Amino acid sequence: APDEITTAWPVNVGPLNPHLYTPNQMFAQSMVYEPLVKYQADGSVIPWLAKSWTHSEDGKTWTFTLRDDVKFSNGEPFDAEAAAENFRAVLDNRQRHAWLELANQIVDVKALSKTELQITLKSAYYPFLQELALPRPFRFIAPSQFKNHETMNGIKAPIGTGPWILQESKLNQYDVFVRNENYWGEKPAIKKITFNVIPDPTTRAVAFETGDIDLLYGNEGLLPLDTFARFSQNPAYHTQLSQPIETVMLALNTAKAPTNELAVREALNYAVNKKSLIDNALYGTQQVADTLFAPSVPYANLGLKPSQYDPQKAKALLEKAGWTLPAGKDIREKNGQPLRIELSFIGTDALSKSMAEIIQADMRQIGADVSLIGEEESSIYARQRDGRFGMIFHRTWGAPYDPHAFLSSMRVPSHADFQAQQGLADKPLIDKEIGEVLATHDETQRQALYRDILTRLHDEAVYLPISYISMMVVSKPELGNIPYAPIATEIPFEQIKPV
Ligand SMILES: N[C@@H](Cc1c[nH]c[nH+]1)C(=O)O
Ligand SMILES: N[C@@H](Cc1c[nH]c[nH+]1)C(=O)O
Numbered sequence: 280a281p282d283e284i285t286t287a288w289p290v291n292v293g294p295l296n297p298h299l300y301t302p303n304q305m306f307a308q309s310m311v312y313e314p315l316v317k318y319q320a321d322g323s324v325i326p327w328l329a330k331s332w333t334h335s336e337d338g339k340t341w342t343f344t345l346r347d348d349v350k351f352s353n354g355e356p357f358d359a360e361a362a363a364e365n366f367r368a369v370l371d372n373r374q375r376h377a378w379l380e381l382a383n384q385i386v387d388v389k390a391l392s393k394t395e396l397q398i399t400l401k402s403a404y405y406p407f408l409q410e411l412a413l414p415r416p417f418r419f420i421a422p423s424q425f426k427n428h429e430t431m432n433g434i435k436a437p438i439g440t441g442p443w444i445l446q447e448s449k450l451n452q453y454d455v456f457v458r459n460e461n462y463w464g465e466k467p468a469i470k471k472i473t474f475n476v477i478p479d480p481t482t483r484a485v486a487f488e489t490g491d492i493d494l495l496y497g498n499e500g501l502l503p504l505d506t507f508a509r510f511s512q513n514p515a516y517h518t519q520l521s522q523p524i525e526t527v528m529l530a531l532n533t534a535k536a537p538t539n540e541l542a543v544r545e546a547l548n549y550a551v552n553k554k555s556l557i558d559n560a561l562y563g564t565q566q567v568a569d570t571l572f573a574p575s576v577p578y579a580n581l582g583l584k585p586s587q588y589d590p591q592k593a594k595a596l597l598e599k600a601g602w603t604l605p606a607g608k609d610i611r612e613k614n615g616q617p618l619r620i621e622l623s624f625i626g627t628d629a630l631s632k633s634m635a636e637i638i639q640a641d642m643r644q645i646g647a648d649v650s651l652i653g654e655e656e657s658s659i660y661a662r663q664r665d666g667r668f669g670m671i672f673h674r675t676w677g678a679p680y681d682p683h684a685f686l687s688s689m690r691v692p693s694h695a696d697f698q699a700q701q702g703l704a705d706k707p708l709i710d711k712e713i714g715e716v717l718a719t720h721d722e723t724q725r726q727a728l729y730r731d732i733l734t735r736l737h738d739e740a741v742y743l744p745i746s747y748i749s750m751m752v753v754s755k756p757e758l759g760n761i762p763y764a765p766i767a768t769e770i771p772f773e774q775i776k777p778v
């Protein structure tokens with residue numbers, strides 16, 4: 280049928296618990312569950328599940344007027360008490376959400392009326408509405424689907440209020456979404472969406488060529504990039520490559536030898552030929568990243584000094600730092616210890632593996648011995664949180680997490696960042712200023728705090744920025760131009776109009 284589409288994703292969508300993370304896929308969570316306010320391209324929010332709201336004079340107590348015509352997909356009603364139960368179920372696992380400051384800010388959530396929801400905060404927290412608009416965790420499953428009054432330990436059926444329903448899910452094969460015919464808002468033209476679980480990038484390309492796939496949508500790992508370029512030349516196909524949405528880099532571990540020496544981290548930053556890396560691994564399709572955030576990110580246009588490819592400088596830095604070449608070897612030594620660094624990455628990811636090989640070859644030219652450790656995704660995430668890495672692939676999160684939610688998350692073991700920053704003398708100051716950037720209502724103070732935080736991180740060579748990556752689309756021409764969602768982790772299926 281024309282109003283049905285088939286697409287692909289490398290893994291199943293997961294249980295679609297609205298209040299957990301791995302292995303739930305964010306775009307899928309955003310198809311089924313909804314927020315109180317909805318994020319916009321211009322950077323604002325609009326009323327969503329909340330029709331309107333008011334706030335106390337001190338800005339700590341917020342009262343939302345919800346919509347009254349909203350039902351979960353199973354018929355049960357969405358009301359303040361339902362909302363209140365969700366927030367409660369979230370905050371029971373508050374430590375897990377500590378990366379997002381709103382989770383540490385909510386003091387109390389009370390259902391006043393059927394339509395009146397009251398939230399109480401520790402402070403007049405300015406990112407309040409924006410953080411409510413995020414995919415997760417502050418979105419709403421039917422309280423009837425809790426397991427023993429909790430969500431943190433699992434849910435029953437993923438029942439939400441969103442315009443899509445998870446109808447069927449088969450492990451390593453497919454997930455199927457049907458339009459929710461009792462959705463409170465405008466109805467999507469598409470009635471059915473079938474996600475074929477196809478882990479391999481090359482297989483995803485082949486599947487598209489068969490005619491069986493209407494739409495591929497995702498980041499730079501979606502298809503091999505030489506194939507995508509080929510596809511873009513094909514008048515029978517449609518392709519798109521958005522403007523950059525986020526940074527891909529290495530996180531260097533400042534608390535683990537030898538990446539604990541500033542001079543090693545700087546030397547590493549000088550050793551990699553990023554342009555050559557990008558041309559070769561990314562097929563010239565992306566741009567070179569010099570800083571944790573691109574200068575187009577709010578608050579990040581700071582004129583930070585780029586590290587250019589300079590192996591001469593790199594080897595000079597190392598020499599001064601006492602890392603010398605012993606007779607008969609090409610790897611440097613300091614106190615009888617070889618300059619070994621462990622680079623961990625997801626072994627099944629083609630792009631990471633390819634970049635890692637390039638990077639390893641680059642560092643060998645400065646006398647650094649990089650060992651590649653490709654592992655399962657879960658093992659990689661585990662190393663990110665406990666700090667068991669020398670260098671680790673890492674990326675930023677896109678709008679609207681960048682930069683504020685991403686900096687916030689640095690303060691706890693969330694992704695790699697906290698652990699990578701442990702060895703820095705000024706780490707406690709950085710964490711303090713991050714807190715202050717989230718607290719201040721003065722733009723001028725916020726500009727300064729961002730400059731100070733981002734400048735330290737840059738000058739202390741915590742990261743090795745590689746590239747700024749894009750979204751890509753491959754589609755049948757009959758679907759027309761495919762739009763992008765304001766939240767980079769969401770896919771705007773509800774906006775696709777078949778013929
Ligand atoms: N935040 C997730 C990791 C993740 C992958 N993609 C998005 N987030 C976790 O720690 O479980
Ligand atoms: N750690 C948060 C934020 C994030 C956005 N993208 C990846 N992570 C989450 O996974 O929900």
Ligand code: NI
């Ligand atoms: Ni995450």
